[PDB]
Ligand binder design. Structure first.
Ligand SMILES: Nc1ccn([C@@H]2O[C@H](COP(=O)(O)OP(=O)(O)O)[C@@H](O)[C@H]2O)c(=O)n1
Ligand SMILES: [Cl-]
Ligand SMILES: [Mn+2]
Ligand SMILES: [Mn+2]
Ligand SMILES: [Mn+2]
Length: 553
RNA sequence: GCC
């Protein structure tokens, strides 16, 4: 049937300058040495990406799908959702959002300037009146940082981002923001992934694992998911939205947004030229996460049913999927997973790597992360979330005139505090840098799901206790997989090995202790792993007085 | 670019 894209041959041009690394990286050249391996994806590679995502979709649904969609619509119908005022929507626009072509930006939008509010009213009127004219979008290459991998062909090409003008983005929120806050949870319940912190993700996967008489687990990811999403998938997303009770004005805007924007349209580069035409998901519109997550849930749950997965418990995050089910023996389990993949492929959600049954929770990876296990202060097993540190290490070394990597360090320290690589490497480096800068008590921003939170380094111990438990400060005897992977990643980026970080950590610890105050608590709590005379660590008062629930919505 |  449909191509995902067509192209005019016009290039995908840059936003402005694409930052160069420098001959000296003063914040990160004591963390690792192989700076050559660390690179940013640029618009030069946008052509290579285009080729790899332009292809013809043919989708074939069936009774399992139909049955699943039916049940999801019913679940949707228990949701009521409101329009947002034009003003509420303006004020959910992030502070640095790309400016409009009509001479105003996000500052004006957030402060409700008259010009801006005016334009947005006209845009909304035109949405309510015209349910048809395709709405033009800009296409840009995303800039992300990775570590070169020769096993996977050198350097990844940039992914493509497609979005409408700022004025339309605000209208999207008016129509659909309230739904994005409610529909996912209503349709998927406990399966909805973005509701959990690391420790909760872990606790959920463990409960799920323990409930089975004889468990089996697998993970799934769709190759180039946005480009596999069909016009029909998108219209089916509308039906799911429409199954909620909504003021009629929302219904009309939602429908018009679907037909003029979501199902497809023309794409312009940043130089203004016509670039191509799209008949798949624009990753850039408001409904990108909600849609990806819901359409993935629909297909996946259908696939489980097509393939005989018994007693599936799921966890879904965009196109990333884990299912833990009752094993039917390894012979049947392997056949079933092939059926699953076959069904998903029919549903136009083909895999990057074919999935595989597993029978040990450590070997299942999803959202680039996995559960692992260590021993706690009293010798009991302690389960926690970790990941390959390669990319976090690479981003820890992205330093330019306009980008400091310190926020990156902080974000990882908080998400992955119980990991051996955060504790020994990133924490040691982070504290060492800030002490020498004398900026320990200065606040930093922590980025997560589009939100930023001001955090003070001297509060890490409390935040960590709240978020991960007091055991995060006392875990030992990490697993073989985990020690192997960390050693290997440090070697690959030319970073000192763990032994050395242990020395550096003893020094950082002592400096912190000698400053007394909150700094000394950082020294005792965060670096107790680093000394022979291991102190007794007690619950922190400041911790009890703390609410971090919004951090992981 | 969006959650
Ligand atoms: N920076 C990102 C990354 C992913 N995504 C969305 O999530 C989808 C799945 O992402 P992924 O990480 O599995 O990579 P692909 O499946 O795109 O190759 C993408 O196709 C996008 O629609 C996004 O909107 N922005
Ligand atoms: Cl313990
Ligand atoms: Mn994918
Ligand atoms: Mn409609
Ligand atoms: Mn994915």
């Amino acid at each position: 049937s449909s191509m995902s894209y067509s192209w005019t041959g016009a290039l995908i041009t840059p936003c402005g300058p694409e930052e160069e690394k420098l001959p000296i990286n003063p914040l990160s050249n004591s963390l690792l040495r192989y700076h050559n391996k660390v690179y940013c994806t640029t618009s030069k590679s946008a052509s290579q990406r285009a080729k790899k995502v332009t292809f013809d979709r043919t989708q074939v649904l069936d009774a399992h799908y139909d049955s699943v969609l039916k049940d999801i619509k019913l679940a949707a119908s228990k949701v009521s959702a409101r329009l947002l005022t034009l003003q509420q929507a303006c004020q959910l626009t992030p502070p640095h959002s790309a400016r409009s072509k009509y001479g105003f930006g996000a500052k004006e939008v957030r402060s409700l300037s008259g010009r801006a509010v005016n334009h947005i009213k006209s845009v909304w009127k035109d949405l309510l009146e015209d349910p048809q004219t395709p709405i033009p979008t800009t296409i840009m290459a995303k800039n992300e940082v990775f570590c070169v991998d020769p096993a996977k062909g050198g350097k990844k090409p940039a992914r493509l981002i497609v979005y409408p003008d700022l004025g339309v983005r605000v209208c999207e929120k008016m129509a659909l923001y309230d739904i994005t806050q409610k529909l996912p949870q209503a349709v998927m319940g406990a399966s909805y992934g973005f509701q959990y912190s690391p420790a909760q993700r872990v606790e959920y996967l463990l409960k799920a694992w323990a409930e089975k008489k004889d468990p089996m687990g697998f993970s799934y990811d769709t190759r180039h998911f946005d480009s596999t999403v069909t016009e029909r998938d998108i219209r089916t997303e509308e039906s799911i939205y429409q199954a909620c009770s909504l003021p009629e004005e929302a219904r009309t805007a939602i429908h018009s947004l679907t037909e003029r924007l979501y199902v497809g349209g023309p794409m312009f580069n940043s130089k203004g030229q016509t670039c191509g035409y799209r008949r798949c998901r624009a990753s850039g519109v408001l409904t990108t996460s909600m849609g990806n997550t819901i359409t993935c849930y629909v297909k996946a749950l259908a696939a489980c049913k097509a393939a005989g997965i018994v007693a599936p418990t799921m966890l879904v995050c965009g196109d990333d999927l884990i299912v833990i089910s009752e094993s039917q023996g390894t012979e049947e389990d392997e056949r079933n997973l092939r059926a699953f993949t076959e069904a998903m492929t029919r549903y136009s959600a083909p895999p990057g790597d074919p999935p595989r049954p597993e029978y040990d929770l450590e070997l299942i990876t999803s959202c680039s992360s996995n559960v692992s296990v260590a021993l706690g202060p009293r010798g009991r097993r302690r389960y926690y979330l970790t990941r390959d540190p390669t990319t976090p290490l690479a981003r820890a070394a992205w330093e330019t005139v306009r980008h400091s990597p310190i926020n990156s360090w902080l974000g990882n320290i908080i998400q992955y505090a119980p990991t051996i690589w955060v504790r020994m490497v990133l924490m040691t480096h982070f504290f060492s840098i800030l002490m020498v800068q004398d900026t320990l008590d200065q606040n930093l921003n922590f980025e997560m799901y589009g939100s930023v939170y001001s955090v003070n380094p001297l509060d890490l111990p409390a935040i960590i206790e709240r978020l991960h438990g007091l055991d995060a400060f006392s875990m030992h005897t990490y697993s073989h997989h985990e020690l192997t992977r960390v050693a290997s990643a440090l070697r690959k980026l030319g970073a000192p090995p763990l032994r050395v970080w242990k020395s550096r950590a003893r020094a950082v610890r002592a400096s912190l202790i000698s400053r007394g105050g909150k700094a000394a608590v950082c020294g005792r709590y965060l670096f107790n792993w680093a000394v022979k005379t291991k102190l007794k660590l007690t619950p922190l008062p400041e911790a009890r007085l703390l609410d971090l629930s919004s951090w992981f919505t």
